[PDB]
Design a protein around this ligand. Structure first.
Ligand code: NAD
Ligand code: NAD
Ligand code: NAD
Ligand code: NAD
Ligand code: NAD
Ligand code: NAD
Lengths: 278, 278, 281, 279, 281, 279
């Protein structure tokens, strides 16, 4: 099994939600923590909270869409603790509405965080991990939206399908390369976190000047209800994720009840049948 | 059935491969053609060839990764022919190698063309089509790599999974919106085209200064053999695609033999089983 | 076999369709190209692209219905390359509709290009080829419309039957005169080209003041549909034509499926039978 | 049964050969005659003889290659007799020799008469006939040279193949348009007429300045010999032609012996076999 | 019930762990906060974040083992808010290892914070609270180690049994003196805090020149593991503690699962039985 | 069976009360005696009387709150008799009154003797005993006040609960380390000794300048009354203690009647019930 005690975990999106939960779980297993977030206030508060729980932790404000900042995060992790054993490419954002009503900025924002942030983390940290000649593991947070295509969330859906596939490919590439570095793919259903309020960290350069359309308002309200009503919490997702890492299990479906809907989409494809609305 | 005679088709990646084949097929059905490509020479030659076959056609040099140029393409199409009835968001590029060995530029290049080009086309042309109150259809070229995750092609794979999902979502959004605009998703296996030589149109700003790694060289050689040995040609893909448009069929699998491998990946997911190499 | 590499081909109608495909095929075999067309824009693009791919090519704007301009085309050919070995009398136009509804200008236009253009080509270039004491060959583009008489195409049909018989006669005349110059007759069915848009190169002096009739409109639209949906392309016509030249075969029927209805017309004649009605389209 | 008594026939080339014989046969059937030829002296000899024998006949000098004059021929026909029921687009000329040795003027001359003269007649008279709502018929004189490609006659051959196909198409077009206007295609072999001396009516603007070549002289000598030695006369051709019109028969082959040579040509095409010389 | 909104809480050890959680809970109830700690950096961050979320709070660096500084903390409390209603004598440290291997400095350090800090708190603030004629309450943090005697923790155990009994006695003394001041005794099991890292705030004068022994290393690592893996958090301890204060309940056992082994120790004593060996960890 | 003849006992608080009685009992068992007290006059009276009766005994004035002096006590013990087999960390003091009314010096005094004196003894002597590879035993004098929390005695109570738990932990630690060193915990109720007059040995540095409060005077009067009226004597406590050492019994409750009150306190804790006043 994968051992955690005294190892180093780097966690993006650590100021909230799953990322904060991963930090708490990692601390309880004896991990040293490198926490990264673009939300300065959330990051600072999470660092202080983890320290008050006895964790050894540093924080590095990081916009994961920026390759130079992700490199800087790795450099900070090595300077502090010498090694990186666990990477959670977890930061994410969303936007909704009829697909054609979204702006170019919306596409750039969501793909910059949800895909390029994951890409940067893999590109920067996998060589470091491969060079250490020790067990290490990379966990990428997708979503059940990486296995399904629900209406009015097409940009988010597409970004999460990209994370699914790049992480599947990563699994094969790491094996073909050899070594003790593995990876997993986390695909949760809705959990009460801050994800429905992702607009709070949209960068100024990507703001929309147009007011939200009717379908965008509807999608935003829908996501809030879905998020607020999830029956598993972020703490449960952290527990299940670390169990999967210990077993080096690739697919982490925290809400396996979704599998009926996933099977439906897969059946559409195998039957070359126009997409079913369930 | 969808009628083509006298209608207007806008085709990206028209200078080669599937795009040139779509232009020839469209011309044989009586369509007016708006051809777009970033490769100036290929675009000009394709325009001349189609004209020598009696087609009514214009060409617009277009980098589909650039939203302003995709808008300009729509403006040129309307100025020439007044309407757009068929859109082929078809331009694409690729890169390969162990996932972490690829550069940030590689990610930006492939996602800029394969995802943002599709996104721009949907964003710009779907409102035009919805406003015409006539039948229209949008075809997005993914790949079987949008349904599978083969090793050493992770960036390409991820971009094509994104196209799959955004197009599935588009299908639902168009229905929820109402109207006569539909869409389809084209997922071919390997076909002898120019796709293995996509580096010919990598923009200067995204060039790699480092020489290719061992795995990148291997992946490039593998793709060339796969592409050169495909048993269906681009003309066959065009024929099958237009048949699907006529029936408004969403999933266009030109090589349905792939479905055994697709089922294998779907089984991995449904069973939460680590990815199988077939 | 007939040698192409290093030889000189003169092609009329080279801006589009078959002529352009002949030029591409000739270039791929190493021929020097003299390309002629009245559509200066199309001709310039054809020449430019062939030259950029490495051809030795000149383009000469030529109205093949004009005897002096055909003579000027031969002069430009000889001035650029010294010889002419292959001549494609290929430019052509068309018009349709009930035969009596067409104008005198329609007859003059179609026959000026389709018959007189071929006639000038033969008259000007055959003596040049005979005087060279070298293998040479003349290919005239007729049509399956030179072997059949489909309705509402009578002016075009008549011009193509004229090309058929003049070329058949040339075959015998060249053998009677003796020497190494031969000829072939190309008779394709519908192929995607610009031929249904021939009005774009009708000269202003032969324009029709009158509005087109119902039967003329119907013939135009039927021809547009038939041409654009042809299953063989201009490239295929060029490939088959050069194969025939190589073996000096006279009849080039690129679409042999036409033979059932050619046989029907022949048996009408042989039985003195009133022409069998064509099937519905 | 197409009926002739009291109907109006327009005949081109009426001063000689087939045209004169059509006129004499039409007169014997009680037709009113409108006779056209570019040769005014020969046209007058035909008209005056028929008028002396009691026919209703007018003569109109006409160059059938000139559309304006063909229109005036129709105008005179309608002015005199009110209707046109039978049209013989019959005037014709020829030239011979190795194909490439002929001049541009040779092409323009032979096609002007043999094709454009027929085209003008169809263009001018077919709408008249269609508008009359009566039985009418157009006869175009081709030749067996419209069915075969004999050597050294390429311009003539090509002109006659054009007549063959335009008349076949006219047959289909008339049926598509509907009505009682029909047509026939006359394809005779050599008959002793004046056709071998067609140069007598070559217009000045199309004169050749060069002397004839060996092959042109050879082709002229062959034609003179072949025309002189036909066993059927112009009267016989007229008899057979009106016989076929009566039955509305399209192909009029006055010399059916040539069909063996026609089958050979057709077989060449059907087999894509290099043209066989029948020797 | 005990009223919190608008009342004044003084919390020692407020920079981390339970103390920080008490301050957060007090802020959420509308209490004015006087927060004390010797870890100036941790205390400043705690105060800053609470104030930014809207608390009325002051932070006062205080070494609770120093009687004068505890008196200074009361003076700062009264100067800022005029009253003290709730006192959490909560700061604490620890050391482990075989009892005889610990130094005199180890005893002085642990007892100075864990016992004397509580003693100074009671001595300084109880008279203030009694003189106010208002409801007030003192909460002393002991531990389940004040109810049990686990091996290799004897100095810490002893200090926490001292807190237990002094607080039990204070309960009776406050009732005998009369009035509205009460007290409670908080006895948690392991919770993720900084308590296993207490060496970070050992004063320089009480440092050990000697290397740590095998049994001291083992005790430190066991404590690190037990603390970090506690299933209840500091927030939960704060929630349960304030619920107990509200009902003025004396014993606060946040981890009642400890009761089986507390009963075992009690029956050892009641039966005059040699202490039952603890189970393997 | 732990054996006493010829073994060495170190006894703190040897000038009075339990400590003097331990010394007399040890002498009767043939032990060599190392006697310590901060009161030099009382220590000399004990030492000289025992020596007169034929014991091997030395006296070492010792303030057990001072680690250096406890070390010197061990040094003198080893110098005179070579070994230490029995240690009574017995010296103790007290103070009373409402908890918050006591001074900082009261806390420092009572904990200095009652807890630090015991801690110093364990720290200094346990490694000696462990290194001897012989049977040895440490006895710490707590009180029933280490098992209960009677009102107005909070400083004393807390100090004695600390002794209880440190000695229980010592019991577990000695077994974890291995060897033949053990310990016991002596928990007597009130006995007529000098404990109610402990202020006679309060060091000058910890003097109170304030006069006593009503509750402190009340607590002093109660203690004087309770101590004077115990029915067991110091000799009896010494008898019971050596009896328990012989059996290696840990809990030494010389007054088992208090266990009803102890069960009540234990029940309070087990039920999380506000402390019951036993009245
Ligand atoms: N919560 C759910 O229901 C749900 C379901 C499935 C998947 N997910 C995914 O889980 C991941 C974690 O999100 P969450 O639910 O904890 O939401 P969250 O909002 O509570 O936390 C996400 C964090 O990412 C940070 N972040 C955003 N953009 C960033 C950037 N450019 N650089 C660095 N940090 C950035 C935010 O500031 C925030 O602290 C995301 O990838 C999300 O898409 C969430
Ligand atoms: N050929 C296959 O085996 C295969 C299989 C599955 C999917 N596909 C997809 O089919 C689509 C068509 O590719 P193809 O196989 O015809 O390859 P191709 O190389 O023959 O044609 C692709 C064309 O896209 C153009 N293009 C590239 N970047 C562009 C940009 N930024 N803007 C505009 N045009 C741009 C290229 O210049 C080229 O003409 C692509 O999306 C490709 O990923 C191909
Ligand atoms: N395309 C078919 O279906 C088809 C079938 C049978 C025969 N044909 C014959 O093939 C030949 C080539 O035509 P295509 O189909 O390639 O059509 P096209 O329109 O593509 O090419 C014919 C070219 O001839 C040129 N041309 C016309 N008049 C001219 C003149 N006076 N002088 C010089 N050039 C002139 C036109 O500009 C044009 O570029 C013609 O003779 C046509 O009748 C075509
Ligand atoms: N005689 C044969 O052996 C023979 C065989 C087959 C077909 N034909 C055809 O039969 C038709 C009749 O010829 P014929 O044999 O009676 O020859 P012919 O010379 O005896 O008579 C033809 C007449 O047409 C006239 N003509 C010539 N050019 C004219 C013009 N521009 N306008 C008006 N009239 C004009 C001539 O003056 C002459 O009177 C011709 O079309 C000829 O091609 C003749
Ligand atoms: N965490 C547990 O498992 C646990 C269990 C039972 C009891 N306790 C008790 O809980 C109390 C709070 O500790 P915690 O667990 O929150 O640990 P902690 O280390 O997170 O917090 C204790 C705080 O006390 C401060 N402190 C230490 N010495 C001080 C001094 N001289 N003056 C002022 N402040 C001082 C430290 O700086 C620290 O901020 C302590 O009394 C501890 O013994 C803790
Ligand atoms: N007597 C009781 O009722 C009673 C009950 C329970 C427990 N105890 C405990 O029994 C132990 C013995 O007390 P006692 O009852 O014999 O009282 P005691 O007064 O008769 O004797 C105690 C002796 O300890 C000495 N001493 C005090 N401070 C000292 C120091 N700093 N260093 C060295 N010696 C010092 C005193 O001088 C005195 O001689 C104490 O720990 C006391 O707390 C007594």
């Amino acid at each position: 099994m994968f051992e955690f005690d005294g190892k180093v975990a780097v966690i993006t999106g650590a100021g909230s939600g799953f990322g904060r939960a991963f930090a708490e779980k990692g601390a309880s297993l004896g991990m040293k923590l490198v926490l990264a977030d673009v939300d300065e206030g959330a990051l600072a508060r999470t660092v202080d909270t983890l320290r008050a729980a006895g964790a050894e932790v540093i924080g590095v404000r990081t916009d994961v869409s920026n390759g130079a900042q992700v490199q800087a995060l790795a450099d900070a992790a090595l300077e502090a603790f010498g090694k990186v054993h666990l990477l959670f490419n977890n930061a994410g954002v969303g936007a909704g509405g009829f697909l054609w009503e979204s702006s170019a900025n919306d596409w750039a924002w969501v793909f910059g965080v949800n895909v390029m942030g994951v890409a940067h983390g893999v590109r920067v940290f996998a060589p470091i991990m491969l060079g250490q000649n020790e067990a290490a593991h990379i966990v990428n947070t997708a979503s059940v939206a990486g296995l399904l295509s629900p209406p009015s969330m097409g940009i988010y859906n597409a970004s999460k399908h990209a994370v699914v596939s790049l992480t599947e490919t990563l699994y094969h590439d790491l094996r073909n390369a050899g070594g003790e570095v593995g990876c997993s793919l986390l695909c949760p259903a809705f959990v009460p976190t801050g994800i429905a309020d992702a607009e709070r960290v949209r960068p100024e350069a990507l703001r929309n000047e147009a007011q939200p359309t009717r379908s965008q308002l509807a999608a935003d309200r829908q996501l809030q209800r879905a998020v607020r009503s999830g029956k598993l919490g972020a703490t449960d997702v952290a527990t299940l994720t670390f169990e999967a890492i210990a077993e080096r299990r690739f697919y982490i479906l925290t809400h396996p009840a979704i599998l009926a809907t996933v099977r439906l989409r897969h059946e559409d494809i195998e039957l070359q049948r126009n997409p079913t609305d369930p």
